[PDB]
Design a protein around this nucleic acid. Sequence first.
DNA 1: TACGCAAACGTTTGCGT
DNA 2: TACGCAAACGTTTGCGT
Lengths: 339, 339
Amino acid sequence: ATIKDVAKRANVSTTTVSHVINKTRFVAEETRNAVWAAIKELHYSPSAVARSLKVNHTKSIGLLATSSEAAYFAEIIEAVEKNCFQKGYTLILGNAWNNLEKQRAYLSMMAQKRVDGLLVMCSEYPEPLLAMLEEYRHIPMVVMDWGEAKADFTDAVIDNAFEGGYMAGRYLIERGHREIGVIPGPLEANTGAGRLAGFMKAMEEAMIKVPESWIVQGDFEPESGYRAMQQILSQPHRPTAVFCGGDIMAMGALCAADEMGLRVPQDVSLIGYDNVRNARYFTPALTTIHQPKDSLGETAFNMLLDRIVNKREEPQSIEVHPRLIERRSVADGPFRDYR
Amino acid sequence: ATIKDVAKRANVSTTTVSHVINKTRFVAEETRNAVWAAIKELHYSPSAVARSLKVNHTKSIGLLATSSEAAYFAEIIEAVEKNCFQKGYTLILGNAWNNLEKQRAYLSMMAQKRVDGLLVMCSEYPEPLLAMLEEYRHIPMVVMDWGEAKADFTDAVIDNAFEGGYMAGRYLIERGHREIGVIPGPLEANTGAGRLAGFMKAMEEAMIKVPESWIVQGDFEPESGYRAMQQILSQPHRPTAVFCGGDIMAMGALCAADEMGLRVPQDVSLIGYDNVRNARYFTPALTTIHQPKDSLGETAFNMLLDRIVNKREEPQSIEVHPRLIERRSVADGPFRDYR
DNA sequence: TACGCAAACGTTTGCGT
DNA sequence: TACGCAAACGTTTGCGT
Ligand SMILES: Cc1ncnc2nc[nH]c12
Ligand SMILES: Cc1ncnc2nc[nH]c12
């Protein structure tokens, strides 16, 4: 029941009970035992609430995610979770779905619940959001998904999604392609706009022109893939290859080509991005840019912890790097031999 | 800063401050305002810890999951999360990975953190686990994944995974198949053993015999799929159709057939189970048993809430039902016309 | 040597008048 | 009418002797 109850059974003071429970000071064996014994019949469970209340910290972190079912997301999340656990923390998962309201919502409940730090992955960042965010500069936090350091009041991990974008395009070019298309993810997010612009650089470098009929915005969702691909192959002249903003949307596009009896890579080449755990088992095996999701996990937790325990004041940023993963969805384009 | 600070700026008592903050009693407008005003410069945030401490409840639920990246899982989880939010709760996500230790681990931190209730999805349930579980009968909890009511000390939601198993087999039979195989998920879990036995019933009913060379245990993971399928098609005589324990493993098997240049459904028919969000976009579009994941979410939260607020004492169980979803991975078998 | 007193952390709420 | 006193919730920890 309560510490009081334990001391009494133990015939010792709560001060004692508490010290033997946190080994915060020496306690006689005979003493220690008894308390243990007491603890064990009474079936005592120390109240962290009580405790947080005195010590001023909850040993609990809050992840304000965008959605958590998405392959990408899920994957990072599981990581972060692995980190909180090994280091004694507790995860409070919370998805805002990109709903400002839902965002002020969670944010507040968190503060109130007095989470030691805050992990942030909101995908898009409008001023209004960035604004709410500042209001909480007091809480240690890191934004795991910016392309640049959006603000001064936080830690940041940076994925170099542009470098990724560029890598994807190059491979395409280097494989013999010149008629390429793209189904970008929303321009309102980094992994969206950033990857696209990375891709667009390489093209310019190649004096390659992407006809706008060949550009089709996705939402990271497989249906979006499906429809984009559809819309691309559903036209007179079609690219010989396509760079797809994320693997799930990629998967999306794979199904629509199969449905038009288009052959991949034989008829259309396909490059994705993220390298989700199931990508290898796409059909065919997906060729994609791999986003280090597990470090993006770890590096964020870490930065936070630092700030948390090392009472760090200054905002810091850590870069991370994507890297090409070669599979079976891409094939040589018409200009390979001429390179 | 603190309630004290607010009352002082407000020139009113904390009792007052608190009442205007929870509208727990009438407060003069002029009064109310001021407090609000105070609250707002001081930038006050009520401490839920403090609060839980007095009121005896955290308005926070704990989900002791198995893993959270898995499609299936992820999907339910997102649901549960949607429920805690709309009803004011807070989710504590925690994966045990089927590690007893990790399981005593989380379980304890939870109690300590004094979560109002406990959602449980541990996949396998050995005595040792069931044992730890009992120790916490005090905390309201429901096990979202049993096939039957494993114990008396909990709420239970039941999926009728056997009924699902049976439905899968029937379709197979009804479509003209008699040489069928199966890549079951681990017998140590419900969704494993249960679905398999459901499938096995129908076969007996059909006087169908499954050669053990045609049975191959998976782990719900795509590689397992891959290898199982591989091992099945890699033999003299092969089934004309296969019932796969879960969609991700199914996806697993799709990739290996493609790799052996086997045609699906043209060469091999494929039935999955779960109906994950991406299943439709498998290639081809997956035919599977759909597990209501979103209700399994909702119904669990609800039961808990009940127990929670309605201080319910008796363990209750709620059934849920799977239902065939027809796609493109199955085709008529050799005996269709003869039926 | 080994242990206890009592004050505090930030709230909520029964009784008041 | 409208508001305040003070005790409590379950711990931790500075000073003790
Ligand atoms: C915002 C977002 N959503 C889903 N998958 C993604 N991959 C990269 N960014 C993503
Ligand atoms: C235990 C388990 N893991 C992953 N996917 C599943 N589908 C049903 N049960 C599953």
